[PDB]
Design a binder for this molecule. Structure first.
Ligand SMILES: [Zn+2]
Ligand SMILES: [Zn+2]
Ligand SMILES: [Zn+2]
Lengths: 55, 67, 115, 155, 46
């Protein structure tokens, strides 16, 4: 419900740097993984849930 | 509308600098001093902060559709 | 609408070969190496290493078109030598140099971190 | 059971040529129109596929050494056309055999589960038995994907 | 079947039936907006 449309938010999220220092060598490329959608061997899950209830 | 996450030119993160920059300006820093204090050395990153227009506040002035 | 997917520049398409070898028939002992899904990075380092070889008479590379992802490397050697041999030896030399550089960078980082 | 082609037009009566090849007279009201088989299948002596609007020779049957153009087709009968034949207004009928040569995934929401587009999600706009067209939610492009790389997302 | 619309003024959800005129049951406003879809929306973050 923000003033920014979905692709705007998604693009900004894509640009957030994430610490990768030791995990990245372990992870497989998602295109190479045998999982069907996303598994801990090829991805990291994030969630965000924020609502403004104040003035 | 909102501060870009990265400098377009070099990719340095600037999206965590806008509120700090506004703070330094109200503390009487000059823009050049404030940009120095935030570590923005290359003139591309400095352009990012110097030229930003925070239009999202104006947009936040309108009531949302859903309560 | 006509944008190619970004992965197209480094992922081989089904059936596409990484590297193809042809003879250059204008002159003797000359080969053209076509490499798919590579760009100036590999082409330039390989060419420069080949130019270090005293038995290589000609070495050069080009990207035929910036919107395509192919490089062509042309190698001519002396008759007592082969362009295939020169290409293989150039890659081996580059790998050796990179391995040494990685070892020495590790050592330098450790020195700097200790003091 | 009997289907025919009207070969002659008159003020009151009709002379409609039926499949059997004989001529029977009927009126305007009694005869009711039937749609034409724009596509169909049949069989022939040579064991080759025959469609409408093909030149064929009647090497056997009621007629002999006769050439005509098919206009309507029946399971075991076919209607031939011509311009050189006085009898029956140039139209006669001969047997087909005697004649010789002379979607369920569309609109569903799918996740690409394999390949370089793994993870993308889209709506299937067209699917054959092997390949599908997927409008991608994120890229403004419709791509063709092998159906073995798709999984339908369920609600 | 429900077909929930949001009122443009009072922001109140309220049911609407096809062939029923558009009017907020609370404030009588005549402009309403449809709610976001429940279909899966997925973006590459590019
Ligand atoms: Zn996986
Ligand atoms: Zn910069
Ligand atoms: Zn209202």
């Amino acid at each position: 419900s923000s003033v920014l449309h979905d692709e705007f938010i998604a693009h900004r999220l894509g640009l957030i740097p994430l610490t990768s220092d030791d995990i990245v060598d372990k992870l497989q490329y998602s295109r190479d993984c045998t999982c069907e959608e996303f598994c801990p061997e090829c991805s990291v899950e994030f969630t965000l849930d924020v609502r403004c209830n104040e003035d | 509308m909102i501060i870009p996450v990265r400098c377009f030119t070099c990719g340095k993160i600037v999206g965590n600098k806008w509120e700090a920059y506004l703070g330094l300006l109200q503390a009487e820093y000059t823009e050049g001093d404030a940009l120095d204090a935030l570590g923005l050395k290359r003139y591309c990153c400095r352009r990012m902060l110097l030229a930003h227009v925070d239009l999202i506040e104006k947009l936040l002035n309108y009531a949302p559709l859903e309560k | 609408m006509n944008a190619p997917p970004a992965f197209e520049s480094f992922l081989l398409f089904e059936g596409e070969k990484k590297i193809t070898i042809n003879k250059d028939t204008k002159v003797p002992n000359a080969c053209l190496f076509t490499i798919n899904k590579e760009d100036h990075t590999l082409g330039n380092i390989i060419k420069s290493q080949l130019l270090k070889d005293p038995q290589v008479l000609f070495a050069g590379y080009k990207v035929p078109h910036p919107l395509e992802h192919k490089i062509i490397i042309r190698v001519q050697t002396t008759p007592d030598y082969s362009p295939q041999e020169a290409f293989t030896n150039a890659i081996t030399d580059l790998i050796s140099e990179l391995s040494l550089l990685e070892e020495r960078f590790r050592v330098a980082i450790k020195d700097k971190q200790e003091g | 059971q009997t289907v025919g082609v009207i070969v002659r037009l008159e003020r009151e009566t009709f002379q409609v040529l039926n499949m059997y090849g004989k001529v029977v007279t009927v009126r305007h009201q009694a005869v009711t129109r039937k749609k034409d088989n724009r596509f169909a299948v049949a069989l022939d002596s040579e064991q080759n596929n025959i469609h409408v609007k093909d030149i064929v020779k009647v090497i056997d049957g009621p007629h002999s050494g006769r050439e005509g153009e098919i206009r309507h087709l029946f399971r075991s009968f076919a209607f031939l056309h011509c311009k050189k034949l006085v009898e029956n207004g140039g139209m006669f009928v001969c047997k087909t055999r005697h004649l010789v040569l002379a979607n369920e995934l569309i609109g569903q929401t799918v996740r690409i589960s394999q390949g370089p587009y793994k993870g993308y999600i889209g709506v299937v706009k067209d699917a054959t038995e092997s390949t599908a067209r997927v409008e991608l939610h994120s890229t403004c492009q419709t791509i063709s994907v092998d159906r073995q790389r798709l999984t339908t997302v369920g609600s | 079947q429900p077909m929930i619309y949001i009122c443009g003024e009072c922001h109140t959800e309220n049911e609407i039936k096809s062939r029923d005129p558009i009017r907020c049951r609370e404030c009588g406003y005549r402009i309403m907006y449809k709610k976001r879809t429940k279909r899966l929306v997925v973006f590459d973050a590019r």
